[PDB]
Amino acid sequence: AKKILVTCALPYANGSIHLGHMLEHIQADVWVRYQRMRGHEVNFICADDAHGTPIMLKAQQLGITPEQMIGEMSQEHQTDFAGFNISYDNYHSTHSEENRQLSELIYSRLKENGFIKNRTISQLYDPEKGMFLPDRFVKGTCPKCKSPDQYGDNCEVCGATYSPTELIEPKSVVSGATPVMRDSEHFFFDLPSFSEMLQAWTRSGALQEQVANKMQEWFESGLQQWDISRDAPYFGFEIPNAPGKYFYVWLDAPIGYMGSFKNLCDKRGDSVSFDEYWKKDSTAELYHFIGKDIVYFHSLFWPAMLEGSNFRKPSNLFVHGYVTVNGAKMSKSRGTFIKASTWLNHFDADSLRYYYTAKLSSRIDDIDLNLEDFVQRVNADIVNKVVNLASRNAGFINKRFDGVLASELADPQLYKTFTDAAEVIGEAWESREFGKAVREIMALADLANRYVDEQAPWVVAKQEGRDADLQAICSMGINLFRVLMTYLKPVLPKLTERAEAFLNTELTWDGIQQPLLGHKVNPFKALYNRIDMRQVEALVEASKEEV
Numbered sequence: 303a304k305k306i307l308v309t310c311a312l313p314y315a316n317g318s319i320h321l322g323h324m325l326e327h328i329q330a331d332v333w334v335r336y337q338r339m340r341g342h343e344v345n346f347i348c349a350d351d352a353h354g355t356p357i358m359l360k361a362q363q364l365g366i367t368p369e370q371m372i373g374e375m376s377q378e379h380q381t382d383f384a385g386f387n388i389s390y391d392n393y394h395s396t397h398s399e400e401n402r403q404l405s406e407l408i409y410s411r412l413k414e415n416g417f418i419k420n421r422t423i424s425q426l427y428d429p430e431k432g433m434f435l436p437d438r439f440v441k442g443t444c445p446k447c448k449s450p451d452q453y454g455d456n457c458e459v460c461g462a463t464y465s466p467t468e469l470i471e472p473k474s475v476v477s478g479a480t481p482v483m484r485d486s487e488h489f490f491f492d493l494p495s496f497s498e499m500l501q502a503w504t505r506s507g508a509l510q511e512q513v514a515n516k517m518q519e520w521f522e523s524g525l526q527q528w529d530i531s532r533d534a535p536y537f538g539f540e541i542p543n544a545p546g547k548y549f550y551v552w553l554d555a556p557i558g559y560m561g562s563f564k565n566l567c568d569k570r571g572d573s574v575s576f577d578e579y580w581k582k583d584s585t586a587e588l589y590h591f592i593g594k595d596i597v598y599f600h601s602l603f604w605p606a607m608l609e610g611s612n613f614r615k616p617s618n619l620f621v622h623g624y625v626t627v628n629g630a631k632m633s634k635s636r637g638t639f640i641k642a643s644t645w646l647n648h649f650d651a652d653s654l655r656y657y658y659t660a661k662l663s664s665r666i667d668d669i670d671l672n673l674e675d676f677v678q679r680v681n682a683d684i685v686n687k688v689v690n691l692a693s694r695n696a697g698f699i700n701k702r703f704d705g706v707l708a709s710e711l712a713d714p715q716l717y718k719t720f721t722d723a724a725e726v727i728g729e730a731w732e733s734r735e736f737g738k739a740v741r742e743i744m745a746l747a748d749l750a751n752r753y754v755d756e757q758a759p760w761v762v763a764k765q766e767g768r769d770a771d772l773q774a775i776c777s778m779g780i781n782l783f784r785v786l787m788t789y790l791k792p793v794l795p796k797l798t799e800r801a802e803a804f805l806n807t808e809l810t811w812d813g814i815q816q817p818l819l820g821h822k823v824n825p826f827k828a829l830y831n832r833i834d835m836r837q838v839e840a841l842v843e844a845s846k847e848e849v
């Protein structure tokens with residue numbers, strides 16, 4: 303019995319969920335469902351990251367309050383995640399009372415502990431709109447090639463990089479007014495003070511090898527103080543005792559993990575679990591599933607923030623690579639930039655969950671969704687290997703034996719081979735070696751289908767006096783199916799439900815030790831149908847048209 307708190311990165315509230323995000327939530331959900339199957343106390347937590355200048359400016363363009371826009375995006379996001387059956391125990395928001403109080407608390411403790419410094423800096427300022435401008439909101443003519451209408455610190459024409467201050471005839475993307483340098487006091491988090499603490503953390507062998515290596519690069523470059531304040535106008539949390547100053551979104555974002563859990567506890571009327579999970583001497587486990595582009599925040603700023611505020615640190619960080627479609631970054635022009643909602647119009651959630659899982663590993667490598675291979679893998683593995691085991695045998699049981707399975711296993715040894723694999727497959731799920739688990743499961747499926755081929759029930763069915771043998775053979779195939787679906791339960795939630803309805807039994811990890819004997823099963827409509835390239839073409843075409 304373990305206590306585990308698992309999170310996925312908090313998606314920004316200024317964009318729709320796409321297949322890239324889904325890889326992250328699907329990987330976490332499979333791990334979480336497996337942990338639940340092994341009987342642990344699990345708390346799967348997430349929320350929308352709703353602060354920041356971009357969000358503030360978007361709402362303004364749309365002519366609505368940031369609170370209205372984020373509210374709409376929060377519902378959109380949760381609807382999509384629900385469509386893919388991501389089993390969160392709570393989905394909250396960084397813009398909440400819980401996060402506000404927790405953000406103020408942590409800040410106050412850090413300051414109290416001498417980890418916050420004051421410093422004045424110079425930055426481009428929009429005198430017309432009356433707001434400091436982040437680089438991406440400063441446009442002008444490239445100093446090098448002189449190309450007009452360039453944004454940020456780089457020219458999309460000659461590719462040169464430079465400070466926005468170097469842009470010729472600068473202009474605010476907000477008002478179009480000419481920007482100017484202006485001073486401002488900022489608050490900094492003294493990350494450098496936790497250097498040794500962080501280095502030991504990196505060196506423990508807990509973090510993924512590739513992540514540890516990455517961190518060594520950052521220590522080499524040298525840690526610096528982190529600017530965690532932003533001036534009004536800004537959509538975020540105001541800094542105590544600092545009128546007109548707000549916490550930079552990345553400061554309150556990870557605290558959102560804590561805010562979402564506190565929210566869950568308070569809603570449950572649970573007054574002891576928050577401290578049991580976050581206090582320094584906690585015996586519970588904390589895990590964050592994140593993409594490799596936000597590792598700096600989670601491996602350096604985050605642990606240091608918790609340490610300096612007297613809270614426990616993450617047990618581990620689980621980093622994943624990026625999703626590519628047909629081998630390349632999603633392309634809007636090619637119709638490979640696919641939204642989660644769009645996907646569900648063409649395929650079911652189980653298909654993508656399975657494809658991603660078959661390709662996932664414990665490393666940070668990229669995951670490629672090759673659409674052609676997708677159709678082939680789904681049809682060959684789900685339809686032809688696993689579901690086939692049920693469909694080719696259920697008919698005889700229902701029509702010839704009134705849905706009743708044999709009183710004994712026809713091949714006890716073969717069944718033992720299947721149950722004997724639970725240890726290694728469970729370890730594969732546990733260690734996040736999803737690709738390994740799937741290969742082992744499909745290897746078993748091949749064995750099961752070979753067994754059925756060897757017995758040839760379609761032949762036995764037409765031989766008089768072989769009734770008892772037919773029931774024995776078909777019952778055996780169905781029990782092998784029972785075991786396989788148990789191993790795949792964390793992966794295919796819906797197919798699993800349809801499987802449990804047919805089998806008249808909930809599938810539990812330990813349950814496979816007791817095969818279904820003299821047991822009534824129910825007839826069933828198609829458990830899973832084949833898909834085809836025409837559907838893929840439709841998906842791509844729709845995606846092209848949507849942008």
Ligand SMILES: CSCC[C@H](N)C(=O)NS(=O)(=O)OC[C@H]1O[C@@H](N2C=NC3=C(N)NC=NC32)[C@H](O)[C@@H]1O
Nearest residue numbers: 311312313314322323351555556592593623624625
């Ligand atoms: C306290 S965590 C705050 C995270 C921040 N709001 C953020 O970052 N939001 S995000 O919406 O841009 O990204 C959410 C997660 O999606 C992941 N991905 C975004 N695009 C992706 C792919 N194309 N492929 C794989 N993961 C992707 C990111 O790495 C990130 O972990």
Ligand SMILES: [Zn+2]
Nearest residue numbers: 444447457460
């Ligand atoms: Zn240029």
